[PDB]
PDB file of C-alpha atoms in Angstrom:
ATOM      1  CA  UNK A   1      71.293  13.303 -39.833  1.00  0.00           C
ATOM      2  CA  UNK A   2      71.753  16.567 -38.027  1.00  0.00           C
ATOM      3  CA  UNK A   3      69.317  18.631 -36.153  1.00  0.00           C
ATOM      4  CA  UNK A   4      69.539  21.481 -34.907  1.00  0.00           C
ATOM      5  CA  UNK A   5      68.054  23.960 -32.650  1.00  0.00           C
ATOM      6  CA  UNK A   6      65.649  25.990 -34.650  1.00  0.00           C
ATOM      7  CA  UNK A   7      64.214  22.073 -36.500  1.00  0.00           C
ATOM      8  CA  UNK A   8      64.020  20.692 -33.114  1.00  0.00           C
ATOM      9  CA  UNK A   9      61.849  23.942 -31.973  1.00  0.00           C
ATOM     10  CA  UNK A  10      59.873  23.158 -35.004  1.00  0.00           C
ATOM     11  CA  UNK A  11      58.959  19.102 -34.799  1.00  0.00           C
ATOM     12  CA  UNK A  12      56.338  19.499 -31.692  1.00  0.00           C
ATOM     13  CA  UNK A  13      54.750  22.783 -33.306  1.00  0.00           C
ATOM     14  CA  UNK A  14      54.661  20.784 -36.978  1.00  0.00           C
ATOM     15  CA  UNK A  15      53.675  17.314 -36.362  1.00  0.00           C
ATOM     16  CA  UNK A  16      56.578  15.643 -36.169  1.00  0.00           C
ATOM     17  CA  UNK A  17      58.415  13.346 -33.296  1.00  0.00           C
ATOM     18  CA  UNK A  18      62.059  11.990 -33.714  1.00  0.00           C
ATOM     19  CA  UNK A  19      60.714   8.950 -34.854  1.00  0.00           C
ATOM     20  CA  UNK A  20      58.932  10.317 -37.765  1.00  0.00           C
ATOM     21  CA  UNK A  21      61.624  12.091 -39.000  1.00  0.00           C
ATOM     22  CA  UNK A  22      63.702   8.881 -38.702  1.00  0.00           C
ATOM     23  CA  UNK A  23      61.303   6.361 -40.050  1.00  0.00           C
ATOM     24  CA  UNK A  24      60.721   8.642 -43.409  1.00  0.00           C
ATOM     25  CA  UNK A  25      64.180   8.800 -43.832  1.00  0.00           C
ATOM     26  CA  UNK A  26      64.854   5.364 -43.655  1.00  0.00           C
ATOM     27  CA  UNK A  27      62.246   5.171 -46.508  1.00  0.00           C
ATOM     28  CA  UNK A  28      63.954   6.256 -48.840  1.00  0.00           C
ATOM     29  CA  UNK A  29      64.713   9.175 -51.059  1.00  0.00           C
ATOM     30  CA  UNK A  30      61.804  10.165 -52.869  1.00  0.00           C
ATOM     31  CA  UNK A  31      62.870  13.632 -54.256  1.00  0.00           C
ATOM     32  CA  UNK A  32      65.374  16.278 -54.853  1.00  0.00           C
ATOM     33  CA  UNK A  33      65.904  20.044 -53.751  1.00  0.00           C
ATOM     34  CA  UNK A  34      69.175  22.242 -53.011  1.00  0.00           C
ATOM     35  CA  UNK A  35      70.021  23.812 -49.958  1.00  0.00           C
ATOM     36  CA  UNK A  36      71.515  27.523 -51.401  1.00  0.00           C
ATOM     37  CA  UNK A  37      71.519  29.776 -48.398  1.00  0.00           C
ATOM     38  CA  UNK A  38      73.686  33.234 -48.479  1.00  0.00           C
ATOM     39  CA  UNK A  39      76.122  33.861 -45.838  1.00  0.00           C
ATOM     40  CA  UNK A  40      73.926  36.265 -44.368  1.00  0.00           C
ATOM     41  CA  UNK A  41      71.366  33.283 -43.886  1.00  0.00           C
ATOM     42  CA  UNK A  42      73.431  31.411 -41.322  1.00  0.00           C
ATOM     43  CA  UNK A  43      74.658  33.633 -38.328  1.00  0.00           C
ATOM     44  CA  UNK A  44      77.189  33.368 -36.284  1.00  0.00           C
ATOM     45  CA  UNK A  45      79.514  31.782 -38.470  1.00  0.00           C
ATOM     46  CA  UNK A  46      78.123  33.023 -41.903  1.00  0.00           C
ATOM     47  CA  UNK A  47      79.244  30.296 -44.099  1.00  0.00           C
ATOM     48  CA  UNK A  48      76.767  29.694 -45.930  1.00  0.00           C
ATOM     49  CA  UNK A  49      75.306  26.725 -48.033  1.00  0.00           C
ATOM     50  CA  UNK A  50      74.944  25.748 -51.470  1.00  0.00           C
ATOM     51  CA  UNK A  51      74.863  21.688 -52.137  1.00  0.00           C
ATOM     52  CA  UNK A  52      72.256  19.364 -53.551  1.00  0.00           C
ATOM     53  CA  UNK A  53      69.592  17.737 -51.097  1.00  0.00           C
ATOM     54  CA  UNK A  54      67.280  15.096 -51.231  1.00  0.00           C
ATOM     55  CA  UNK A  55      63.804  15.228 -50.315  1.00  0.00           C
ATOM     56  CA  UNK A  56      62.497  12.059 -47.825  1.00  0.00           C
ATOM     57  CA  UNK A  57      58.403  11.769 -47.641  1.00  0.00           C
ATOM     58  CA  UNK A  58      55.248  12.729 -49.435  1.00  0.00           C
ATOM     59  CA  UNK A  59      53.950  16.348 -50.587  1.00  0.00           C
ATOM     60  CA  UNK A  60      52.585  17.892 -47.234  1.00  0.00           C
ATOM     61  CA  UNK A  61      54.889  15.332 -45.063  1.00  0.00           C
ATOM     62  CA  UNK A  62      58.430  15.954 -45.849  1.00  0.00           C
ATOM     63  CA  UNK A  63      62.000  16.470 -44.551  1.00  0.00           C
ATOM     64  CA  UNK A  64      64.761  17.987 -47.186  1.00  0.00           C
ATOM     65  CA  UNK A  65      68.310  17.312 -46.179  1.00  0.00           C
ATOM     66  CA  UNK A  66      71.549  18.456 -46.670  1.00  0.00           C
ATOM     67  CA  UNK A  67      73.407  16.012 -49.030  1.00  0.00           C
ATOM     68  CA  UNK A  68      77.261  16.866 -47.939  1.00  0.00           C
ATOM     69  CA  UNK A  69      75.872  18.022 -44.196  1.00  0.00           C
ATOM     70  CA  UNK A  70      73.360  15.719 -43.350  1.00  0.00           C
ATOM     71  CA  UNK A  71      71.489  18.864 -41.938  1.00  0.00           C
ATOM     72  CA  UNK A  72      67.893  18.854 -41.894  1.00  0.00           C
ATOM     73  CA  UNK A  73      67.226  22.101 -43.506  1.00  0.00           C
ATOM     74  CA  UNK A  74      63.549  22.150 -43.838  1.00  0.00           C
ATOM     75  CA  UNK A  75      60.589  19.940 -42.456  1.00  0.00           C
ATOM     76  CA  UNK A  76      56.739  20.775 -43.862  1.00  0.00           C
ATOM     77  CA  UNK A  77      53.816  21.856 -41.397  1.00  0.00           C
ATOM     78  CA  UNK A  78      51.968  18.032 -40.907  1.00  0.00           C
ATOM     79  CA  UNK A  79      49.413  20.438 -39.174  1.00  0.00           C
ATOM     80  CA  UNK A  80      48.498  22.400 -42.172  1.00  0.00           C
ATOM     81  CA  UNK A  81      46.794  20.339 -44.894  1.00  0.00           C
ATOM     82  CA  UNK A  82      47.083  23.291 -47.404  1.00  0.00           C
ATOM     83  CA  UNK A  83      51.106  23.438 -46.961  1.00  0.00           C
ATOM     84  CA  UNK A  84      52.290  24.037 -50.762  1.00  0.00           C
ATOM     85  CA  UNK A  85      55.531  22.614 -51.114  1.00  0.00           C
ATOM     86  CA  UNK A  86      58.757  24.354 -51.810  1.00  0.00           C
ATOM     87  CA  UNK A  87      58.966  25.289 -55.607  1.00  0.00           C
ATOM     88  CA  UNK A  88      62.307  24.030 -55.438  1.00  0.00           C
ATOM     89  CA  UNK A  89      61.529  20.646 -55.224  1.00  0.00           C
ATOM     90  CA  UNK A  90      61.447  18.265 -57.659  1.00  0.00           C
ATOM     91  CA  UNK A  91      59.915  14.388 -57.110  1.00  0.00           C
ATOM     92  CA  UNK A  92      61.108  11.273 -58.368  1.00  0.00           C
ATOM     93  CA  UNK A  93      64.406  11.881 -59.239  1.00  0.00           C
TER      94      UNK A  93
ATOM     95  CA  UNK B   1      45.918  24.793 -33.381  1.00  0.00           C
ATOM     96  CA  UNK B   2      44.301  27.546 -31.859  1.00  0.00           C
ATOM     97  CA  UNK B   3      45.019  29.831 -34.897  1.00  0.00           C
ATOM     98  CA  UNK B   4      44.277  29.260 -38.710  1.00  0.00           C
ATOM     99  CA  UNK B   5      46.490  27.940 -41.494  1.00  0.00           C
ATOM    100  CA  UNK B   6      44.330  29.722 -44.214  1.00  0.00           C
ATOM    101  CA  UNK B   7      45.049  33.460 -42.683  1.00  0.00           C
ATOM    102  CA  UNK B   8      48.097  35.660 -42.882  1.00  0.00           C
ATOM    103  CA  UNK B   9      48.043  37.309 -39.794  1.00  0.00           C
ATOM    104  CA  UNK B  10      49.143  40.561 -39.312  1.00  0.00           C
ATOM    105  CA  UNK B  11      49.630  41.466 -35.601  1.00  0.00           C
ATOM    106  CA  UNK B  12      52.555  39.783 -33.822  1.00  0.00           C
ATOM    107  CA  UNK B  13      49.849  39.496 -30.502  1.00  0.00           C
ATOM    108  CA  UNK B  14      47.943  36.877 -32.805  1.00  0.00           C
ATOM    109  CA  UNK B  15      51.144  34.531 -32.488  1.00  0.00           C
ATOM    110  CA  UNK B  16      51.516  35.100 -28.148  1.00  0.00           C
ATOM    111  CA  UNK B  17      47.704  35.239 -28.098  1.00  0.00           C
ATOM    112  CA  UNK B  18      47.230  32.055 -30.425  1.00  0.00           C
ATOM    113  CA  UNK B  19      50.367  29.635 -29.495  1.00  0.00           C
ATOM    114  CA  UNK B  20      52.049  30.532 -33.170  1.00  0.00           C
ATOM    115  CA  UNK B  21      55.600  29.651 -32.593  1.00  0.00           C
ATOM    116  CA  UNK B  22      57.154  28.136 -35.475  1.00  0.00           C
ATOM    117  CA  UNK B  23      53.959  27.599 -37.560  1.00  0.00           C
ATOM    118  CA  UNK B  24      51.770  30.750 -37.711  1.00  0.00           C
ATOM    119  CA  UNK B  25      52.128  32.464 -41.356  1.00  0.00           C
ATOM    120  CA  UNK B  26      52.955  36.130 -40.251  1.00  0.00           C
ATOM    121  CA  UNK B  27      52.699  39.238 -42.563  1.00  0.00           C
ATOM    122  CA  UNK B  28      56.320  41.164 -43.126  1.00  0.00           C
ATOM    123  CA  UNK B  29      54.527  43.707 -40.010  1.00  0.00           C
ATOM    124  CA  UNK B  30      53.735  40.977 -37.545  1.00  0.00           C
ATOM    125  CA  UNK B  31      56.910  38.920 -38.257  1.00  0.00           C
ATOM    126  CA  UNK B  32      58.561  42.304 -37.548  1.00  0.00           C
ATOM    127  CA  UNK B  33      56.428  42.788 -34.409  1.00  0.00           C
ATOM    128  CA  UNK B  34      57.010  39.125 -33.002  1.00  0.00           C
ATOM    129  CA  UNK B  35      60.653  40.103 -33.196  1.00  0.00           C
ATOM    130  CA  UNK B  36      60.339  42.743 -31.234  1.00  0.00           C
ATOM    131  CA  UNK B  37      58.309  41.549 -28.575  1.00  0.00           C
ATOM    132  CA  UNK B  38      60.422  38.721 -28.887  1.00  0.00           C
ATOM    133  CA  UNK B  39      63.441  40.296 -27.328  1.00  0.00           C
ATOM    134  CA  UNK B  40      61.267  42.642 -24.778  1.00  0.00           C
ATOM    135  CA  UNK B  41      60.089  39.375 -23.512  1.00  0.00           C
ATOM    136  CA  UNK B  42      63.581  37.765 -23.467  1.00  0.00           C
ATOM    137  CA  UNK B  43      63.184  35.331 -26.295  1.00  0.00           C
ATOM    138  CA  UNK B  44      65.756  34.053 -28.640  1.00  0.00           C
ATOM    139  CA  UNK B  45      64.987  33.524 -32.215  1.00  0.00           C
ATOM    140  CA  UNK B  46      66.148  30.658 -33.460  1.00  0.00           C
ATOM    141  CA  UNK B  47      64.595  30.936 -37.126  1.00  0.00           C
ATOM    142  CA  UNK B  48      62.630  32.502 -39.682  1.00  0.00           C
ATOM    143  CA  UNK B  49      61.063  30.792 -42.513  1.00  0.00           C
ATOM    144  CA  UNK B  50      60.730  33.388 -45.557  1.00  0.00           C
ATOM    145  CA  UNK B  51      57.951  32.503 -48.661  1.00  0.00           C
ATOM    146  CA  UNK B  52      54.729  33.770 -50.316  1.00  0.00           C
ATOM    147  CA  UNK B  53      51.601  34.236 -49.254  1.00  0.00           C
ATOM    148  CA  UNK B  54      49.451  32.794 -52.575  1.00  0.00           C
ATOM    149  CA  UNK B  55      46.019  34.336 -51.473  1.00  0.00           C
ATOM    150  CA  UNK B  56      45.662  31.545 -49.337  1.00  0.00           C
ATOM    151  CA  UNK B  57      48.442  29.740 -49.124  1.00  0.00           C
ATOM    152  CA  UNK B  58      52.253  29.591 -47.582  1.00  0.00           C
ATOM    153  CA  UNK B  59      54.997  28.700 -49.937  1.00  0.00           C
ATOM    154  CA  UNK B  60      57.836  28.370 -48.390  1.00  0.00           C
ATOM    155  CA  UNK B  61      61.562  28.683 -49.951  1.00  0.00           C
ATOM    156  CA  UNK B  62      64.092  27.128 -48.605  1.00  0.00           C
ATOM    157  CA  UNK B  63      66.625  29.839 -49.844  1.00  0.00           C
ATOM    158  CA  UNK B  64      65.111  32.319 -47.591  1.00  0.00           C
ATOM    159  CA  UNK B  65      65.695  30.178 -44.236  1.00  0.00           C
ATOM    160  CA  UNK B  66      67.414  32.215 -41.458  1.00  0.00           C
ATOM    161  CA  UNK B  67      69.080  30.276 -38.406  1.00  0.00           C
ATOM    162  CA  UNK B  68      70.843  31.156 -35.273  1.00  0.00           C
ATOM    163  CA  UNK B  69      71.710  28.507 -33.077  1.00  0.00           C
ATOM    164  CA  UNK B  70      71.347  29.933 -29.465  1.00  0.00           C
ATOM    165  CA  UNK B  71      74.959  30.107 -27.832  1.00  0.00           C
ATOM    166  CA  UNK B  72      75.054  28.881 -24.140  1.00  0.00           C
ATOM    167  CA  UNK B  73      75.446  32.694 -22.851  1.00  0.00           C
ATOM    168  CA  UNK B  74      72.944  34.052 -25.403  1.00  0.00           C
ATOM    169  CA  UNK B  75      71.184  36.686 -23.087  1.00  0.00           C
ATOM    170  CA  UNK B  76      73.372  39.248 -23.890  1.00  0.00           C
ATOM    171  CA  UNK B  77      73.268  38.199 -27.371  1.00  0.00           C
ATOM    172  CA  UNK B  78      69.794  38.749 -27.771  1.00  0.00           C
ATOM    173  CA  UNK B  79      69.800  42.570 -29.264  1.00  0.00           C
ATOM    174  CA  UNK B  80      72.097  41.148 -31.606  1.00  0.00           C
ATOM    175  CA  UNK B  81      69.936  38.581 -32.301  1.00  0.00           C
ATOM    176  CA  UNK B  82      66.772  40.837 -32.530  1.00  0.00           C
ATOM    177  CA  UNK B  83      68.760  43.085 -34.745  1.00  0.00           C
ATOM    178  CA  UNK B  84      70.067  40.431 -37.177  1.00  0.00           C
ATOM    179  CA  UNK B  85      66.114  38.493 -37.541  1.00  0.00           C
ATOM    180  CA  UNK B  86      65.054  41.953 -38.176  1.00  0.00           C
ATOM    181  CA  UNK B  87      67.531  42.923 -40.498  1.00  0.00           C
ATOM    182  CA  UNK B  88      67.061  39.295 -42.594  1.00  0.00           C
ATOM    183  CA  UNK B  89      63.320  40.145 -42.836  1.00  0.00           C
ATOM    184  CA  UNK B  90      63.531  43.439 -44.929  1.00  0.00           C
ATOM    185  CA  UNK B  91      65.942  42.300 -47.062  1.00  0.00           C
ATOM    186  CA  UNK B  92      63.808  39.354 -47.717  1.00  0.00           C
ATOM    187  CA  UNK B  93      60.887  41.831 -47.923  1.00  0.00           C
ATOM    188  CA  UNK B  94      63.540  43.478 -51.241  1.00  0.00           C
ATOM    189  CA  UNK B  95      63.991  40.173 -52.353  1.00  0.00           C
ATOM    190  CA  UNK B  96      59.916  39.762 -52.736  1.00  0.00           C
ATOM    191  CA  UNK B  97      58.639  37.646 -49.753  1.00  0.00           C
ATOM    192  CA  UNK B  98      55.476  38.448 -48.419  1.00  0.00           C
ATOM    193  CA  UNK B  99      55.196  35.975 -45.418  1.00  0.00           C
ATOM    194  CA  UNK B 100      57.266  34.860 -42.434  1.00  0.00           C
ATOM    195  CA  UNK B 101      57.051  31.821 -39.776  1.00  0.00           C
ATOM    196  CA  UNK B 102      58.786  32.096 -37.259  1.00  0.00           C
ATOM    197  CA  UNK B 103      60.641  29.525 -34.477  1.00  0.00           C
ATOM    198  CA  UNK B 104      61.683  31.422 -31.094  1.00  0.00           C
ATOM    199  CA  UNK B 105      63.215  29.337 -27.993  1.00  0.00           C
ATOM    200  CA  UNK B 106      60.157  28.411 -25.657  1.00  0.00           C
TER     201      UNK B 106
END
C-alpha cells in the first residue's frame, strides 16, 4: 500500500489511524471501484490514472485502492455517519 | 467535530473558524475562498475532494480527486499551487459538482 501526503492529511481529520487502514485491508476485498483520474487531476507530473481498484471495508468505513499502484486513492469520513458512498462502487464482487 | 456533516457551508471562515480541514463539505464559493486564504496564510493544498451535495448529503467521486504532493521547497510553489486547486474547482464546477472537501498541509 501507498500513502501519500494529501491521505495521510486526511486519516486524523476522518477517523482513521495506520492501523485501521491496515487491519481492513488485511480483511479482505470486499468490493470494487476504478481509479480514472485525468491528467489534469494529478499535478506535478500529470499522468494520470485509469485502472481497476478494489474496495477494503464496510459502507461508511472504507479504503479504495489502486489495483496496479497500490495507492490509496480514497478513504470515507468515519466521522460522518451520513457519508454516501461513491456511486462508483460496486460490493461483493 | 466542531462543525456539522449535514450543512454545506458556504464561507471558507467556517472551515479556519470550525477546524474543517479535510472533512468540512464546502460550497464551489467557500472551497474557492479556503483556497485563497489558503495561500495568504501560507498553506499548501494537498487535495480537493469534488462530489454532490444531495440536499443533505456528500457524495463523493473519486474521478474528481485532485492531488499535489507538497515538494520539499514548495513555498515558492504555492501561487502555483493556489492557481492550479483553483483552476481544478471550476472546471469541476463545468463538469457538475456542487461540493468540495478540502485537505491543506497543517
Amino acid at each position: 500500500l501507498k500513502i501519500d501526503q494529501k491521505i495521510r492529511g486526511q486519516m486524523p481529520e476522518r477517523g482513521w489511524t495506520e492501523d485501521d487502514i491496515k487491519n481492513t485491508v488485511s480483511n479482505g476485498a470486499t468490493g470494487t471501484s476504478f481509479d480514472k483520474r485525468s491528467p489534469k487531476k494529478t499535478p506535478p507530473d500529470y499522468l494520470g490514472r485509469n485502472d481497476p481498484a478494489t474496495v477494503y471495508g464496510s459502507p461508511g468505513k472504507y479504503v479504495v485502492v489502486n489495483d496496479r499502484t497500490g495507492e490509496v486513492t480514497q478513504i470515507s469520513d468515519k466521522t460522518d455517519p451520513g457519508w454516501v458512498d461513491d456511486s462508483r462502487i460496486q460490493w461483493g464482487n | 467535530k466542531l462543525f456539522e456533516h449535514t450543512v454545506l457551508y458556504d464561507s471558507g471562515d467556517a472551515f479556519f473558524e470550525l477546524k474543517g480541514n479535510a472533512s468540512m463539505k464546502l460550497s464551489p464559493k467557500a472551497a474557492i475562498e479556503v483556497c485563497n486564504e489558503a495561500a495568504k496564510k501560507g498553506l499548501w493544498i494537498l487535495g480537493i475532494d469534488g462530489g454532490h451535495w444531495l440536499n443533505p448529503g456528500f457524495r463523493i467521486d473519486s474521478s474528481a480527486s485532485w492531488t499535489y504532493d507538497m515538494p520539499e521547497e514548495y513555498k515558492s510553489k504555492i501561487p502555483e499551487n493556489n492557481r492550479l486547486a483553483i483552476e481544478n474547482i471550476k472546471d469541476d464546477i463545468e463538469n457538475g459538482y456542487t461540493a468540495f472537501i478540502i485537505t491543506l498541509k497543517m
